[PDB]
Design a protein around this ligand. Structure first.
Ligand SMILES: CC(C)C1=CC2=CC[C@@H]3[C@](C)(CCC[C@@]3(C)C(=O)N[C@@H](Cc3c[nH]c4ccccc34)C(=O)O)[C@H]2CC1
Length: 455
């Protein structure tokens, strides 16, 4: 039985476009989904998309025989500097499958043993920073988690030290990367982008792209010249051959992969740690259980690879933070052919869907009535979760290549944080979620009291 799709309020000839004229568009779309339900049409001059929020429909959207990854306008704007790297390439572009085949073994769970020592290097810098704070001082949580995640991907990725724990001002590459990401996201709600009023934006955008290309191209050239085999992603990309084509990646594509990894490993990854610590300080019984596990498992001055794998409750804490506030909160699909979604919604070839991940993760038919409660134990029996209910890393062959890397990093540093410190929500922090490329708890601060356990 073919059904008419709900649609939020319109603004005459602008249709729904002004609803995304807001600094919190994901949260705005979540409130629309609360009102309209599992699917709604969103129209703007010259475009239509459909926002999905239910496991019932998203399980069908996740069928790779019917739907492929679409580049959202967000991704198309980011492609001006991430090029045909893995994140901003179409599945049908030669460089997508070549890079996928070359890089997948470098990102496997087994590959994490090789990155572990470098991850420990940066995690120990974070612990030392907090051990060295004076009594009257607090922690700026997203700021420090971003120092950790950026430095970890730079060191593990390219053997490059951003030295974020030695700085107040971002590294110049990061200044340019953040300003380019801001400009990409600002262009989403910029009417009349060719207005000469935006000439200075365009000049600054080009300058920022040049900064990024110059440093990354120089790192690649320097590595090729030295012949150093540093067993990092860059070594793996210079040496690796796609089994299918038999070709390696070219230097330009390697640059795009590095820029892509640095984007993803910045606030997108540090957001998970920031939300996890937010939920732990707001749920003291959960924090106590996580801290008990950290003390029981992390018996050595430095965590081992196997000990991080042992932090099962810490893993469930991270999955429960990804459930409520997934930090890459949407992805886009297109219909490969004419098809009917959920027996009710006919789609034509090319028709676009958006998956609103935070709303999927609040589907009471999956999670039950308590969907707003932070309860890591809901991940104790993962075989009981229906297909495609939990999608913080996207879908299928276009799922996050960084999933094992991100969860290993996050589990290691959260375990060390819980072993080494007691935490205080000293301001009774009121959650304020800032939306950029990603989501973060803006202004989240805590005090950490050392347990005085040596490293
Ligand atoms: C780069 C990666 C990490 C991101 C992916 C994203 C996907 C969906 C985005 C996003 C969350 C930013 C806010 C807009 C939103 C929700 C979106 O639906 N956007 C649609 C619809 C849209 C909004 N404004 C537009 C202007 C023109 C065309 C389309 C649009 C889109 O981008 O396509 C955004 C965050 C950044």
């Amino acid at each position: 039985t073919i059904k008419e799709m709900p649609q939020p309020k319109t603004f005459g000839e602008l249709k729904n476009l002004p609803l995304l004229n807001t600094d919190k568009p994901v949260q705005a779309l979540m409130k629309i989904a609360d009102e309209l339900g599992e699917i709604f049409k969103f129209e703007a001059p010259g475009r239509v998309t459909r926002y999905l929020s239910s496991q019932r429909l998203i399980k069908e959207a996740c069928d790779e025989s019917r739907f492929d990854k679409n580049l959202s306008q967000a991704l198309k704007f980011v492609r001006d500097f991430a090029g045909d790297g893995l994140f901003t390439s179409w599945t049908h572009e030669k460089n997508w499958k070549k890079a996928h085949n070359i890089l997948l073994p470098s990102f496997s769970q087994q590959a994490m043993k090789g990155y572990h020592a470098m991850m420990v290097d940066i995690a120990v810098q974070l612990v030392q920073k907090w051990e060295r704070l004076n009594a009257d001082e607090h922690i700026e949580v997203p700021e420090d988690m971003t120092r950790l995640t950026l430095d970890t991907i730079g060191l593990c990725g390219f053997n490059y030290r951003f030295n974020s724990f030695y700085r107040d001002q971002p590294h110049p590459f990061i200044t340019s990367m953040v300003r380019a990401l801001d400009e990409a996201m600002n262009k989403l709600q910029r009417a009349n982008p060719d207005d000469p009023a935006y000439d200075e934006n365009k000049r600054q955008f080009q300058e920022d792209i040049k900064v990024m290309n110059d440093l990354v191209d120089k790192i690649i050239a320097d590595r090729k010249a030295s012949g150093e085999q540093s067993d990092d992603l860059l070594t793996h990309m210079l040496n690796g051959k796609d089994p299918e084509t038999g070709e390696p990646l070219d230097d330009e594509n390697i640059r795009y992969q590095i820029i892509t990894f640095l984007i993803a490993g910045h606030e997108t990854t540090s957001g998970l740690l920031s939300f996890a610590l937010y939920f732990l300080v707001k749920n003291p019984h959960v924090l106590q259980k996580a801290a008990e596990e950290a003390a029981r498992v992390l018996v050595d001055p430095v965590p081992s690879y196997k000990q991080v794998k042992q932090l099962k409750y810490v893993g469930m804490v991270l999955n429960e933070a990804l459930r409520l506030w997934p930090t890459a909160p949407a992805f886009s699909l297109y219909a490969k052919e004419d098809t009917v979604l959920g027996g009710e919604y006919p789609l034509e070839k090319g028709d676009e869907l958006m998956v609103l991940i935070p709303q999927l993760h609040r589907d009471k038919t999956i999670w039950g009535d308590d969907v707003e409660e932070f309860r890591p134990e809901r991940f104790e029996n993962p075989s009981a979760i229906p297909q495609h209910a939990f999608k913080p890393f996207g879908n299928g062959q276009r799922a996050c290549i960084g999933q094992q890397f991100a969860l290993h990093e996050a589990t290691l540093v959260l375990g060390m944080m819980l072993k080494h410190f007691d935490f205080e929500d000293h301001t009774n922090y009121e959650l304020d979620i800032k939306e950029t490329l990603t989501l973060k708890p803006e202004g989240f601060v805590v005090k950490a009291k050392s347990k005085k356990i040596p490293l």
